[PDB]
């Protein structure tokens, strides 16, 4: 339902023409650091509890290796 | 036990390019639509 | 001269839903899962086509003519596979819009939530049933073991048993029940799916900022149209490269031999996609505590709305909570690397300490962790 | 003019792979 | 007991992802088969087409 | 026979070879008749992984 | 005033 | 005390909206006395709300933020709609009053 959805009082957008821009303008060198910077700011809430679990799994593996070996 | 073997590996080979063919052309189709949105610039000025 | 697109009987609807319905112009790549779990159901349903039309599954040699699809029908491995393996991605990108929805805050929505658990609660059950149906050993001794479950309620599991079984191991006609609700409950997936749909229509989309999305919107084609088909193309590519290069990959082989009772197997789990919720069977040591710890954790996830004591919706602007939520994700793949490991030292107790923590995050921590996060905003 | 030269291709690097492996590579002595 | 030991990975002419089977070692192997294994195991699934 | 030839060719590599003297230790203390259910199973598992990882590393190359 | 107003540079944007 | 207001003030930092310009209000889940909140606001403030719930959408869009010199400190975050919001929960409270008796 476009035109009755909100109403919005003095903003201005500019765009433009697909055609007259590039499509991937400085993709690499301003891609890089904006993925870098979303890692950055996400891998500190991310990351730990999937080290805490690798280190759960290993621990795991390493006691179902260590099960009997021959005990004395 | 896998008599499909070699025919499946070789539908994976025209897999492979069929997909190398066709996803840079959706990806850049995409980018292409989407580029009116992600040049689009704001601004405010109350009276 | 009248606009064909806004006067047509037909095509009102299609534009309606397809064309010119307003979306948020910030949605990321999350919510195409959705849009690629409906494509899969369908293809589903079209291998679904292709395991009936040419075949003839059996009561007693169901294996035997799995095998002759495989080697004496022409492309029958090819659409074997990509129907097992399309499950599979099915269960993945279900996971994934779970996720998106428990994430998001997208449970707001009451009843398009809840229309999401009675899908789920079908797909569990069309998953189980196909994969009781190809007759293999361990798909045996799962559905004997799970009906064993599930005969103890009185009047509608020893009834249901007579009914569906014929005798308890084999007996003229066993599997027809089987393959007759598995044939026919997909297609009350797809009118769920499509309830979900009407209902999402009408409440409208989310964005990920989980705010009011009224001031910027944009029609869903162009761009989100493409955006699904490269969602689709890729999803695809994904799929038959499970299917065509690593088919035996998130499957097993321990299914590949012709099923014999006097036989036990050595190692016996569910497919992947079940094998945390066989961990809670494994947790709990009662077989009607363990059936309804199975309805419990899916009715805590319909039960996820009324938990939601923080006035943010989405999380992005949640780091306490953002945090338990990767401690619960990563209690989830440590259930389902429990529910495959057999049942020893320690890993009972691993499983005791993971359900006992899947269970106080999503109960107790986490609207605890929202009333914190409250509080230090200086909301109250 | 394109997709004939594309499963030949495809085809033609699939025995460069798998030289003297197929059974058309072994069609001289077992025939 | 329960311990058992798991077989190493060899370098076999299929293992690679593009890799095809080699088909005059099918063929000695199913000459094998023949001499040998037919006497004990089967192929119920297999013809000779 | 080729394996046989791989067996011996990389017999004397050090891990197999420590792993073998540990079999031939446990092979003198069971001989003692302590009327035990202990054997040499583990370090025998363990000289057998060792050889036959050396075996699947170069193996295939000698045959056809 | 609608003549204060001018489009922004899209240099970086532009062919 | 003084290192709960520095631990608060890191967590402000740490949620992330300042990062996209929005204000603390501005991130309410829009309830139904959130909703008659907004419709008694007045109309510069509703007009700054909407301005910023725009570009937080088209800055979440290109996933970029704002400048470190743009972002909302913690001095200008002031609280516009909490006396419209505790107003409208008063009522609210007052009527299901009334209602129970
Ligand atoms: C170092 C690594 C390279 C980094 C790099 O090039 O960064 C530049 C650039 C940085 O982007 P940015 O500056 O952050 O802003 C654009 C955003 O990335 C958002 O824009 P976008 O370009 O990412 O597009 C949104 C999203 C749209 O996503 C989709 O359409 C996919 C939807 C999900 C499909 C899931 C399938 C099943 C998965 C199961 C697991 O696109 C993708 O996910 C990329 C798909 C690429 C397909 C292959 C193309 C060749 O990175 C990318 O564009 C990422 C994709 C690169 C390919
Ligand atoms: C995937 C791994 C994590 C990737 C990651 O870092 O994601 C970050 C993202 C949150 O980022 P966000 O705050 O949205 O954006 C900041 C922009 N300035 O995180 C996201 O967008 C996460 C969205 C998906 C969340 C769910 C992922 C797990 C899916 C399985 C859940 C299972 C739920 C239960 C199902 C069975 C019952
Ligand atoms: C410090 C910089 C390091 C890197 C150097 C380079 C600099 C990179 C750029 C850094 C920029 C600054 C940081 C930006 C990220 C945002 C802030 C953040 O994440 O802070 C760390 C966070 C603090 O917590 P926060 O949510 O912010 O709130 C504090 C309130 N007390 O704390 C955390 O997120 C820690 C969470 C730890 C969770 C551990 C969970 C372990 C247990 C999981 C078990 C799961 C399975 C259970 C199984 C049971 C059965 C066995
Ligand atoms: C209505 C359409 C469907 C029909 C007619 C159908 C029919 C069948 C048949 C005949 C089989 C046995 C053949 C085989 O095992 O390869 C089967 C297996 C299976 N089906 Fe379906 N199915 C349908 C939809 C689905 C859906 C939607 C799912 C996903 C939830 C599903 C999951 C499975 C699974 C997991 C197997 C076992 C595959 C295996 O042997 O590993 N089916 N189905
Ligand atoms: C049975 C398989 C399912 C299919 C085919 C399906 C399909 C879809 C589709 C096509 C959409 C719209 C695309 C989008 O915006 O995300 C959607 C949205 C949604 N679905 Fe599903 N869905 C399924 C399962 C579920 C389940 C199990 C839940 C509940 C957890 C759920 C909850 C939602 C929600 C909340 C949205 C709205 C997204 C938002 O605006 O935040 N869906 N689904």
Known sequence: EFGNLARIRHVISYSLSPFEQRAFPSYFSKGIPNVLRRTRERILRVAPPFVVVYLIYTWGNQEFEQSKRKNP | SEPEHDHRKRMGLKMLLMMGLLLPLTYAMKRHKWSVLKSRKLAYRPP | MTNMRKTHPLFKIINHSFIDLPAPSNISSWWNFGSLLGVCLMVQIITGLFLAMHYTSDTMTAFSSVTHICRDVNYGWLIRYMHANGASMFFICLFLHVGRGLYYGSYTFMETWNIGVLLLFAVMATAFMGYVLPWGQMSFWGATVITNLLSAIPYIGTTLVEWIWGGFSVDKATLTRFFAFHFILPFIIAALAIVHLLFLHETGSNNPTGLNSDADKIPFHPYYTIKDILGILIMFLILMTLVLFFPDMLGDPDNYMPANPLNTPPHIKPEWYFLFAYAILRSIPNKLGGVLALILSILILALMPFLHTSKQRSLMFRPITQILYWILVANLLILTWIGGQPVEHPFIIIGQLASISYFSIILILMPISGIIEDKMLKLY | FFERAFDQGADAIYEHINEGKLWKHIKHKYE | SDLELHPPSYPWSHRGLLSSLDHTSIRRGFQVYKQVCSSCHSMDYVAYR | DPLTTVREHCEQLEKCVKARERLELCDNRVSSRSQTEEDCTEELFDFLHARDHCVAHKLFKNLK | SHTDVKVPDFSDYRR | ?101
């Not at chain 8, 402000?12 to 419709?39: S, W």
């Not at chain 8, 007045?42 to 933020?65: C, G, S, V, W």
């Open chain 8, 1 to 101: 005390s003084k290192w709960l207001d520095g631990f608060r003030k890191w967590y402000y930092n740490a949620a992330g909206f300042n990062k996209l310009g929005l204000m603390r209000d501005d991130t309410l889940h829009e309830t139904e006395d959130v909703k008659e909140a907004i419709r008694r606001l007045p109309e510069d403030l509703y007009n700054d709300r909407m301005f910023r719930i725009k570009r937080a959408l088209d800055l979440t869009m290109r996933h970029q933020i704002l400048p470190k010199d743009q972002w909302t400190k913690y001095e200008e975050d002031k609280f516009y709609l909490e006396p419209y919001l505790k107003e409208v929960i008063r009522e609210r409270k007052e009527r299901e009053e009334w209602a129970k008796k």
